[PDB]
């Protein structure tokens, strides 16, 4: 049958000089299987299901580093968005990223995702062609421009067509 | 396995 792997990343800025909270939750077939939370005392990706226990220390270290990088990345993004929409520092805002792969019964990619929402609103999204972006509004147009210029689509498609599919397959192999 | 984001918003 068909399957899917999705990650949800959320960056929420606190109030006052509050460092944002960054969370990342991974799902397989819409069931949480991994999680990272900045608020935690010892922040790292933790398995949320016993069948993930089989992954060695190297794996857990590597993906934890990814989360570490992502936190900084989102920090830069949040400060940048305040500029795009003319907003004040003290406030509380949320940027969410959703990406992952739907795979068909044939084992091939049904669809790939890489999209963002800011304060509950749609911002920018990678189109089904995995080549073009849909910008929701004015700010999103600035981003799209940069990502088109940068050739960002190719980077994310490479992941969606390769590693994303393979990892999903590897995770399924457990159960 | 999660993916590193590159180009900022």
């Amino acid at each position, epitope marked *: 049958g068909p399957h899917s792997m999705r990650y949800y990343e959320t960056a929420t800025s606190r109030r006052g000089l509050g460092e944002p909270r960054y969370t990342s939750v991974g799902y397989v077939d819409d069931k949480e299987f991994v999680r990272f939370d900045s608020d935690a005392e010892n922040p790292r990706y933790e398995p949320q299901v016993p069948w993930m226990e089989q992954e060695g220390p190297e794996y857990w270290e590597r993906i934890t580093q990814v989360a570490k990088g992502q936190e*900084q990345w989102f920090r830069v993004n949040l400060r940048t968005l305040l500029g795009y929409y003319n907003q004040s520092a003290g406030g509380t805002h949320t940027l969410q990223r959703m990406y992952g792969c739907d795979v068909g019964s044939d084992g091939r990619l049904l669809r790939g995702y890489e999209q963002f929402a800011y304060d509950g609103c749609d911002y920018i999204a990678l189109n089904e062609d995995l080549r073009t972006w849909t910008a929701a509004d004015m700010a999103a147009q600035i981003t799209r421009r940069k990502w088109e210029q940068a050739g960002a689509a190719e980077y994310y498609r490479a992941y969606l067509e390769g590693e994303c599919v393979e990892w999903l397959h590897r995770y399924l192999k457990n159960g | 396995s999660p993916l*590193d984001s590159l180009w900022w918003i």
Partner: T-cell receptor
Amino acid sequence: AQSVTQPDARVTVSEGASLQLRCKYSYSATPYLFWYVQYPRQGLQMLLKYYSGDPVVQGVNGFEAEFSKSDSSFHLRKASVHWSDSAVYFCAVSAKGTGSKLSFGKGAKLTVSP
Amino acid sequence: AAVTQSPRNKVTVTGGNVTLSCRQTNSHNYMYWYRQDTGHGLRLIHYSYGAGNLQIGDVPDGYKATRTTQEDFFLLLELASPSQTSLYFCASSDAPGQLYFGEGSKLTVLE
């Protein structure tokens, strides 16, 4: 702490010869690695980029670098250099996610004798 | 690289006030100011991750910087000293460690 070490400030090779430019870095986390090139009277520009996955990355004109996690190295190489390759080459290491954690090497001035 | 510095050439006397302009119209997030000297490679002076933000580099002494807008990053030399005779580069960045360099501003401070 974060740093990049290139051993030789100056390098001369004959046109047609092979090239290796060495680079060592010190950084506690998993980095992005780059080679930049600065042609005479210009600014720097990206030549090679490493994000993750395959340790060997490739660039224009037969340039490539190899990431070695065990040695903390990112040596550059090219099978056959030409006069137009005469330039200053900079190795660079960056933290992921931010732009606030980037370090350039001292650079290596390559002279290719025609 | 859509990065343009101005002026490209500048000569001033010790004590003078010098302002270098850097504009990048691609609205990159990060901007940097470097100086380049024989035997010291490229040295970071100041950088910024957005309008209104300023972060000191490795050799900030004698320099101020201002990110008035997402596109504009000025470098200011308040009481120009001969030691600031150098080649200055501005750079923008749209991804971690990925920089696009200006064409350079050559400055000499006369004593």
